[model samples]
Target: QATYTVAPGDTLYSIARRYGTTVEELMRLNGLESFLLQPGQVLKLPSRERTHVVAPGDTLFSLARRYGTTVEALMRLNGLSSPEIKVGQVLRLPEEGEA
Candidate 1:
């Protein structure tokens, strides 16, 4: 689910920086030889620092255990004061190997 769709005025570098990644990394990962990008072209990002979108019935406790993380880590990273969550809310995941 960690994908980016190239849109107007977006360069590989811009997207990479926005996602805390590198242009060369995404370029190699997406297998593009040139810098040219088109609107709506989907590209993948390294999943090591991916995010998870919240859905119904999702609680901090459930997600912590579901992703093999902890409620505290999720709260600290996502800025939650309680275990409550809502649909379409995006939560940042712990970087791989951090937890």
Candidate 2:
């Protein structure tokens, strides 16, 4: 799935429109309960990045937050139920693009 960072004056509806998607789909993809987002908050923008390259100082927790996806989702995609990761390793992200 795609990911998006929250910018100033951004709303779920506006983002959904920008991505050629609907608000309901956006909420469902990101598991959002409300249309609220904090600055610096990242969102799963419903895409097909497939795998994300691990960056320095990155952890599963940080990656999950950065992708607006849960750690469980991350783990599930990578076939990892544990919380360990290595730098430079490629991990599969979610696959909501074709859904």
Candidate 3:
């Protein structure tokens, strides 16, 4: 699963769109009501496994190491051919049950 913080001008619809989910799914996960959003509100987002948001200084190698995986594993999981990643980009991580 992923965690997303509500930012200014954010709504359930927009957040769902950005995360490739539906507003109903988001609500089911977080028990949200209406489209109201408050800045800095942390919301639990549903994803295949765990999800990581790229940071300013983040690299695929660093993330893989942090998560006890390899760059190649991350690339395959995310369908990336290069290490290119932008800040705020959400990436799916393999679950512990995975090899």
Candidate 4:
């Protein structure tokens, strides 16, 4: 979970994308009544981080695709500058929101 301050031009869709989550999740977590967002409004992000073990043939691109996230998101979450990974390496994977 994390906090994000809404800025001008910020929308739920954009915010959810930036945080690797969904608008419904945001609305549920924050109890939003409408699609409208105000600048400086605070939002709570759902827990999107989960652990994954690198298996043989596993790659960042594949993992990102499998997890429905972007490679940049995985890198940002794990602080990785490169896609290099080893077997058995634990990675922080972004998972879909729970219904």
Candidate 5:
């Protein structure tokens, strides 16, 4: 697995999007919790394992409950606001025990 070190102006979304992964994958990869990130943080980068790709006709709440994560944490990980996830979109989940 590849890795990325956090730096100024970096966020899980920015890192994930740049790395072709999702924030949820980053979270579980590094066992993360808080939304705030700082410089010098190292993260396991770009993989398919911890992310859930939304299927056709899947609503936000569909995967919302499908992954067994609390709605709050799930939203935070994905940077979600309005419902706009489409089919085949990469999405992240909560930590293993945070569900």
Candidate 6:
């Protein structure tokens, strides 16, 4: 397994293509309910993946929802004070099994 950080203009379709996989497979492996992703959010890439750079208008809440996780869990994992997050920041996301 590997990790991929979300970046501006990134879509699951594009990421999957880059990894030589399909969006369905990637989404299934990550338990992703939506294609939407936030900058600075990390995803557990099954294999053949790379990290993405964060951009503007990103939040942990958005990331949690997209990745089929709860914001509370994300905060717990990161030791954050609130849901607020910034661009260019990196977060480690647990795999589907762990989440």
**In terms of lDDT, which candidate is strongest?**
4
lDDT of 1 by residue, 1-99 (tens): 378789999899889988889989998899989998898899998676558999998988888888878888988898889888899999998754445
Model 4 segments more than 4 A misplaced: 50-99
- Whole-model lDDT per candidate: 0.84, 0.78, 0.84, 0.86, 0.76, 0.71
Q: Candidates' TM-scores?
A: 0.51, 0.46, 0.50, 0.49, 0.45, 0.45
Report the lDDT tens digits of candidate 5 across residue range 6-80.
999999998888878778878988889976788998888753436888888887677667766566676788898
RMSD each, Å: 6.1, 9.4, 7.5, 10.8, 11.4, 12.8
Question: Which of candidates 1 and 6 reaches a greater lDDT?
Answer: 1
How many clashing pairs in candidate 2? 4
C-alpha RMSD of candidate 5: 11.4
Which pairs in model 2 have colliding backbones?
1-47, 2-45, 2-46, 2-47
Q: Which candidate is the best by TM-score?
A: 1
TM-score of 1: 0.51
Pairs clashing within candidate 4 = none
Model 6 / residue 23 / CA error / Å: 0.5
Positional deviation of residue 65's Cα in model 4 after best superposition, in angstroms: 34
Cα error, candidate 6, residue 68 (Å): 30
Put down candidate 3 lDDT per residue, 30-78, tens digits, no spaces. Answer: 8877677889999898755778999999998898888877888888899
- Clashing residue pairs, candidate 5? none
TM-score of 2: 0.46
